[PDB]
Each structure stands twice: as C-alpha cells, then as structure tokens.
Design a protein around this ligand. Structure first.
Ligand SMILES: *[C@@H]1O[C@@H](C)[C@@H](O)[C@@H](O)[C@@H]1O
Length: 38
C-alpha cells in the first residue's frame, strides 16, 4: 500500500489530496459520489 492516489481517485477533473494514512479527493461543486461519479 504505497500511495493509493496514483492519478486522482475521482473519475472527473477533481484534485487529489492523500497521505500515508489519509485519503480525500476534492470533488466538484455539487458532485455526488465517493470519487466524483454522480
Ligand atoms: C483541485 O481541486 C479541484 C476541485 C479543481 O478545482 C482543480 O482545478 C484543482 O486543482
């Protein structure tokens, strides 16, 4: 488990933001879904 965020988890034009223990993606203004899918 080395760097889960390789190319942004979100399946959109979102932004990545994770570390050795955390994991959070910056979805879009009004976008539902764990990885911007809705
Ligand atoms: C990271 O956040 C997302 C939501 C977008 O605004 C990107 O342009 C930015 O780099």
């Amino acid at each position: 488990d080395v760097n889960e965020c390789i190319s942004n988890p979100c399946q959109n034009d979102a932004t990545c933001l994770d570390q050795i223990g955390e994991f959070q993606c910056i979805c879009m203004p009004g976008y539902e879904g764990v990885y911007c899918e809705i």
